[PDB]
Design an enzyme around this catalytic site. Structure first.
Site, PDB file in Angstrom:
ATOM      1  CD  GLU A 120      -1.616  -0.075   3.634  1.00 28.89           C
ATOM      2  OE1 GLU A 120      -2.415   0.916   3.534  1.00 28.89           O
ATOM      3  OE2 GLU A 120      -1.523  -0.788   4.669  1.00 28.89           O
TER       4      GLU A 120
ATOM      5  CB  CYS B 107      -2.611   5.730   3.124  1.00 30.26           C
ATOM      6  SG  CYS B 107      -1.217   5.292   4.185  1.00 30.26           S
TER       7      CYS B 107
END
Ligand code: NDP
Ligand code: NDP
Lengths: 527, 521
Positions: free
Chosen positions: A258, A297
């Site tokens: 990620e 994020c």
């Protein structure tokens, strides 16, 4: 005398790294907190003990038994929340509500997997789908199964979620019978190390099931082998460096990534300033900009609104951002604390300057004095809101991520879906964790969402009917997939049961009916 | 002067490579067949046209519509089988029955996905699982979906299966709405190119949906971008080179690998010479060594038998292998043809020589005169059977693959305490991850238990017993409804498995929304 040197837990023992270590500091006060070091560890035995003893011990248990251990960890973490909040305040500089995302988000995620795990039953392998006949007379058939990989799970985690990054990953790993070695980001490693220490000290999990290393990452990937899995969270640049490693290129270990994501929020054409959906959009943009000072994020980085709505949007965002007070999280009056570190503070300010070369600054409360904090010591950045009037030709909007309380608004030309242009603009992010969409019309949300699906790991639709129930643009519900294509890493995590595949090998068993019957008695899958 | 130069199909047009090209030859007779060349192709345009024009066109169609096109290809391929068999005989040197695995195996697989695809209906995205509530009042819910990747699918395929390797991969790719660029291995590219030509000529698929490039691979990975996917079949060495490429390491494109695999066959303790399971084991080992001259990724390479069964096993294998006639596949008396090339002939002989350094050669029919073939021209290798008496301390047994009609038998120590086959499982695991293990017993129930013990190190476990003597689909045959791939050395890849194959070509996304919006997709 010096601050506490945190010990690593490797090969079933607490071992200090050698040397002076690396100091972790309070990003608001600058106070030295603790130190970490991995210097001189026996990495061969750290990995072998986890893989051999940790793996054997976990696999000896059933899914249900492992889930029961997860439920015990939940109770333990719950009892020690007071310690965790104090660490979060000091090490991360986050308000209590923001710390809660990490701490209580972590515990919630772990509990969800404990509950789900109980439903996996008293078996050592999982059933993948159902039997398929391979013969006219049904004498010969195929059944797929999932078996835990005989490796370790290495987590290379990001600084933003020392608690949630650990448990989000460790819950499905341990549930799957795979031993965990966690390597938290150094700057905020303290909470991670304390949680692991509490769990290890409690003896809930067998020896070797859970290990921690803090400090230098040198040598870790050299110990990774073909049946191991690695889960990395952080920058796209670091991810590419990892991918070149022999552990992956030669030995074929699994790697989930990620990475960078310029998440979009799209104001639908029907969501004009006079409608309830408009207010929901303004609220969500401000929340995502400010929670953890935008250090999620999944935070909204690009907000696309109809040309006609641009001015009212900017005015509304300005008014709401103005209520965001910044400073020391120890003060109840403070709505937003600091970034994680003075280094991040420098990166973020450089990023703001960069964006400013190609965008107009519509909002910036930098001049407002910090509450109970010294602007010259604290890593506080005030919210900054940019406007990019020509997103089609914008050189930075779709490419440059500022990992702070910063977002850019851009108009789109209303049109096919009225939002077709916004969809194209979102796609220019080159693949993202999440897009959110805002409309008054629930019957409109589906078509738009499907248009975003191939470029976004998650599409989050906010409308009046779900004002009270929608779970947040940036919040990662463990029952839903987390990850995204392209720049976001091409990874997948969570999504409830979907998280288990990463930790298993799937195999086709082709055999006589009675053999399929006997192997099936030894498997389970939730209804 | 000169054999046919096969054209590439790129950017919707037929384009010849420049230069003299690379000659494909008959591995039995040495006859020059055709030439390939990728020299001077505009790769940027080839990939852009496929991704943009091809991808948009396929995605405009529904799953059912694409499945219907697949069904049309099936009929087309069926009607042209005579042409395909003649190419297989000449280019691959395989018997009719072995050619059938490639040609009719390919067609079967395509048709299986056409049928599966019809069931997916008139939609453009798939549901993954069911809707889930995210709120106490159920006003907010989540549904996962699968959407086609906005890229191309590049297949770098192995020489052994020019037809099946194509349709294997192309079926799920096209069903998923992802445009295909196939790059078949040079030596046997002809069948692949002819099938693609027939399909393209027919105009079943939109321009851009199906492209083919034969000859040098130079520059192909350079064109791969972040939403593309690549499927490689071949050596571990080459796979490692591919994995290092910026297309994957920097740009994060998907890569599936199927590589070298020392597949096992395990004779269960109960399967003594006087039992029906014993002969099933002998027959299967011989079949896997000889079909396509052992040139299947899935072929049995290591056969593990109880210490007490070793001599009867060797003698039975010797007797059966003696029946395998070798030579020109045009002769109906021949049971096993040639390897794909003289180069492969030399590679296999080297491999045989290497294994012999650490193993005893129990059977070798190299001196038996070939049928209608010249040993100095043809790439005919005879069956070779090795015995490794101490598989625990054996180095080469578990590590060195020979891609020919070659396997090694080893005894295991039966466990007499509380599975009998425990040591055999440990020995199979020494192959460091494989495509397939087969297991042989009179006891169906026991096989289910043993299978679970092999599952974490084998992509497929294939159990043969008297009850399925007539119905078992073969150790090495890849049934498309079952997963194909394996952990570790086998490449960590996953292909086929029916609808499982579609995941590779889609992105999965969580849609969270008002429940009304969820209900109607
Ligand atoms: N311009 C910039 O610098 C930007 C940065 N970011 C953010 O930076 C944050 C990450 O902090 P970090 O140092 O700064 O960045 P990286 O993504 O490394 O951070 C992720 C984790 O990987 C570990 N790691 C770093 N390098 C290696 C390596 N070579 N081998 C093995 N592991 C390694 C790091 O450990 P450790 O922390 O202990 O070094 C870190 O904990 C990310 O969350 C990203 O969102 C976002 C936008 C722009
Ligand atoms: N000791 C031995 O004898 C061994 C033999 N093998 C055998 O090797 C066989 C496969 O090799 P064989 O077909 O000669 O060919 P090789 O694997 O070299 O090449 C196979 C395919 O991969 C392509 N390729 C190679 N490098 C790249 C690259 N960098 N980028 C893109 N594509 C690339 C080749 O293209 P191009 O046409 O440009 O070469 C060809 O299409 C296996 O099936 C196995 O049987 C495996 C291991 C050991």
């Amino acid at each position: 005398h010096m601050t506490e040197l945190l010990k690593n837990h490797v090969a079933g023992q607490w071992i200090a790294g050698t040397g002076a270590g690396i100091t972790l500091t309070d990003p608001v006060t600058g106070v030295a907190l603790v130190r970490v070091s991995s210097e001189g560890l026996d990495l061969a035995r750290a990995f072998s003990f986890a893989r051999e003893d940790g793996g054997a011990a976990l696999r000896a248990l059933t899914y249900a038994q492992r889930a029961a251990r997860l439920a015990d960890i939940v109770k333990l973490l719950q009892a020690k929340r007071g310690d965790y909040y104090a660490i979060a305040t000091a090490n991360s500089g986050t308000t209590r509500n923001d710390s809660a995302v990490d701490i209580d988000g972590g515990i919630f995620t772990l509990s969800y997997y404990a509950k789900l795990g109980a439903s996996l039953g008293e078996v050592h392998a999982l059933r993948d789908g159902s039997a398929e006949s391979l013969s006219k007379d049904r004498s010969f058939s195929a059944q797929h199964v999932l078996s835990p990989t005989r490796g370790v799970a290495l987590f290379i985690n990001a600084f933003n979620f020392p608690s949630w990054g650990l448990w989000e990953k460790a819950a499905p790993a341990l549930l799957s019978g795979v031993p965990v070695i966690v390597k938290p980001a150094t700057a905020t490693a303290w909470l991670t190390q304390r949680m692991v220490a509490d769990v290890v000290d409690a003896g809930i999990l067998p020896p070797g099931a859970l290990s921690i290393i803090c400090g230098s990452s040198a040598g870790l990937l050299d110990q990774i082998r073909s049946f191991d899995v690695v889960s990395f969270t952080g920058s796209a640049d670091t991810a590419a460096t990892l991918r070149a490693h022999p552990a992956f290129v030669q030995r074929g270990a699994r790697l989930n990534v990620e990475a960078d994501s310029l998440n979009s929020a799209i104001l639908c054409a029907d969501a004009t300033p006079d409608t309830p959906a408009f207010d929901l959009f303004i609220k969500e943009v401000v929340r995502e900009m400010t929670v953890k000072s935008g250090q999620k994020c999944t935070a909204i980085r690009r907000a696309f609104v109809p040309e006609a709505a641009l001015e009212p949007v900017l005015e509304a965002l300005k008014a709401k951002l103005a209520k965001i007070t910044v400073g020391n999280p120890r003060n109840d009056a403070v709505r937003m604390g600091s970034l994680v570190s003075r280094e991040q503070y420098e990166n973020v300010l450089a990023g703001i300057a960069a964006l400013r070369e190609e965008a107009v600054l519509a909002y910036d409360s930098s001049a407002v004095p910090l509450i109970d904090a010294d602007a010259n010591i604290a890593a506080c950045v005030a919210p900054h809101l940019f406007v990019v009037n020509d997103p089609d030709n914008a050189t930075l909007l779709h490419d440059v991520e500022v990992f702070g309380p910063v977002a850019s608004v851009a108009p789109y030309r209303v049109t096919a879906l009225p939002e077709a242009h916004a969809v194209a603009l979102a796609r220019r992010g080159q693949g993202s964790l999440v897009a959110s969409i805002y409309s008054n019309d629930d019957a409109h949300l589906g078509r738009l969402a499907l248009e975003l699906a191939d470029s976004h790991g998650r599409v989050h639709a906010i409308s009046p009917s779900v004002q009270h129930s929608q779970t947040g643009h940036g919040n990662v519900m463990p029952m839903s997939l987390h990850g995204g294509p392209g720049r976001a890493g091409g990874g997948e995590e969570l999504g409830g049961l979907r998280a288990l595949a990463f930790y298993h090998r799937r195999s086709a068993i082709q055999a006589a009916s009675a053999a399929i019957g006997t192997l099936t008695q030894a498997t389970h899958w939730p209804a």
